[PDB]
Amino acid sequence: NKKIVVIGGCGTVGSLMARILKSKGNDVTVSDIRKDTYLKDIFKSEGIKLDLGGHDLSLIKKADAIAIAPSLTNNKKVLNLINKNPKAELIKIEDILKYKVKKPVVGITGTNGKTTTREMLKNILKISGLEVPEHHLNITEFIPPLQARLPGDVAVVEIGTFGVKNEIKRSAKNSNVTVGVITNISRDHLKNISFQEYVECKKEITEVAKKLVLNADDPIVASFGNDNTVYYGIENLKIKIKHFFEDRDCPFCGKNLKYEEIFLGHLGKYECECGFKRPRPTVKAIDVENKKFILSIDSNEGLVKLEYGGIFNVYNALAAAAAAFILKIDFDKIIEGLNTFKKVPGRMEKIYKKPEIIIDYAHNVAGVKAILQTIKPKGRLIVVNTISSESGIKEDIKIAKILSSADILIPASYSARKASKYTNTTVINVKSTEKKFKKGTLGASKFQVEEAIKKALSYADKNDTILIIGEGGVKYGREIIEKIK
């Protein structure tokens, strides 16, 4: 119970440091040269007074302890101020990291589905009366460990990697992850690195998490399994779908894996002659249909009715379910959490009726495959691709080839245009994707997405579907359509 200043306490980490210290009972006040923060609402909500547009010397001087945001650990202007109060005690992020997390921490990792799994679980937990710490940020590595140190009952955090080694591991150990979840593994973030190296990065979660929630339908994820592992998966479909199959090699002997049934891409029921076989999942999805399936866990069975449907959403729901089960959450509550879950925007979002216009965050082969498998246009399919795969041209090409099923493909980014020359469908381009004046990757712009959408509307009938995929598309689609009305 002391007086603490948090210089640069409006930054991503500064904010969390501030809140954490405040949650231990302290006369906390944030000091920042910046005069604007979206965090004023949550700051005032938790009893953290502000001192923006410059630092109050009296504040700093009187205060007993001062916290410094990592991004300003060695800033002359800031240290010339911290040393105006030499007898005060310093609190850098390492000190806050020393703080013990005792709350159960659920860590979610994987290629796709992390966000939806995370929010589904957050819903399940919340309606069950459990406090989950929110970082309340508009954006790293220190976010997950610090978020988990915020007050609450159970922490649910995202631990991803661009493919950088020990990222997952360091952040997971620092978050004290007790329950480790892996949604799926596929090609993404492979800019310079190998797919193999990426998989090795993902395996890191299994080096810290005591318990593991693994996808049994993903051979690579499944092979990570230990003694404290709960597996989830699909046992059967009642609907017929397009496989979009992707090969997988046996992780133990290297031979190409044989599949007896396929659900989505590389997710299915597999086996190897060496003896490796898909584990029978205890958290399963029975009689899967588009927007309805029976979730079965031990002796319990409950009908899940999802708003946004699709096999990949079934998988997200299974992972969330499995995590909750590990947490001993009542079955009916797991069901309620799933059935009342509100899907995140940008996830198969309808933003126009005739023609149908959907926007979706899909940004890799697995994402495009998932939505293409789920989407069922009654009319034609016009795709507007704003994707500029972070892996590079190789996956862009793969995505374009996948997109060949589209009646029309309209590239909305430089990368997407470049890649579309290797696809076997009708390709209609726009001038904004014609010449890149600068070097290196240049993501889809508002104007490029604008031109592409207009071209799409120009070709679409009232009964057609225009699917807008990618970051740029989700980001500018609504306003482009609204300014066009």
- Please state the residue numbers annotated as binding site for Zn(2+): 250, 253, 272, 274
Question: Is the distance from CB of 263 to CB of 303 less than 8 angstroms?
Answer: no
Q: Given the complex with Zn ion, which of 266 and 455 has the nearer CB atom?
A: 266
Which of 38, 162, 252, 422 is in the footprint of Zn ion by CB under 5 A?
Answer: 252
**Bridge pairing between strands 27-31 and 155-158:** unpaired
What is the end-to-end Cα distance of the chain in Å, rounded? 56
Q: Given the complex with Zn ion, which of 239 and 274 has the nearer CB atom?
A: 274
Name the residue type at position 72. L
The size of the interface with Zn ion (CB under 5 A), counted in residues, is 6
Minimum CB separation of residue 195 from Zn ion in Å reads: 18
List the beta bridge partners of residue 427: 409
What does the block give as tokens for 95? Answer: 């000190």
Minimum CB separation of residue 65 from Zn ion in Å reads: 57
Q: Given the complex with Zn ion, which of 94 and 247 has the nearer CB atom?
A: 247
Residues in the chain after which the backbone breaks (C–N beyond 2.5 Å)? 139
The residue range among 119-127, 248-256, 332-340, 354-362 that interacts with Zn ion, by the rule CB under 5 A, is 248-256
Q: Is 250 in the site for Zn ion (CB under 5 A)?
A: yes
Minimum CB separation of residue 258 from Zn ion in Å reads: 10
**How far is Cα 419 from Cα 435, in angstroms, rounded to an integer?**
14
Minimum CB separation of residue 133 from Zn ion in Å reads: 42
Q: Given the complex with Zn ion, which of 6 and 222 has the nearer CB atom?
A: 222
Minimum CB separation of residue 272 from Zn ion in Å reads: 3
**How far is Cα 190 from Cα 163, in angstroms, rounded to an integer?**
7
The residue range among 52-60, 88-96, 223-231, 251-259 that interacts with Zn ion, by the rule CB under 5 A, is 251-259
Minimum CB separation of residue 256 from Zn ion in Å reads: 9
Minimum CB separation of residue 249 from Zn ion in Å reads: 8
Q: Given the complex with Zn ion, which of 28 and 250 has the nearer CB atom?
A: 250
Q: Is 371 in the site for Zn ion (CB under 5 A)?
A: no
Closest to 257 measured CA to CA, from 230, 278, 231: 278
Angle, helix 365-374 to helix 311-326, in steps of 10 degrees? 110
Q: Given the complex with Zn ion, which of 256 and 458 has the nearer CB atom?
A: 256
Which of 90, 239, 253, 484 is in the footprint of Zn ion by CB under 5 A?
Answer: 253
Minimum CB separation of residue 277 from Zn ion in Å reads: 9
Annotated binding site: 250, 253, 272, 274
Question: Is the distance from CB of 370 to CB of 312 less than 8 angstroms?
Answer: yes
Q: Given the complex with Zn ion, which of 253 and 303 has the nearer CB atom?
A: 253
**How far is Cα 14 from Cα 4, in angstroms, rounded to an integer?**
13
Q: Is 220 in the site for Zn ion (CB under 5 A)?
A: no
Q: Which of residues 263-302 bind Zn ion (CB under 5 A)?
A: 272, 274, 276
Q: Given the complex with Zn ion, which of 222 and 387 has the nearer CB atom?
A: 222
Positions touching Zn ion (CB under 5 A) are 250, 252-253, 272, 274, 276
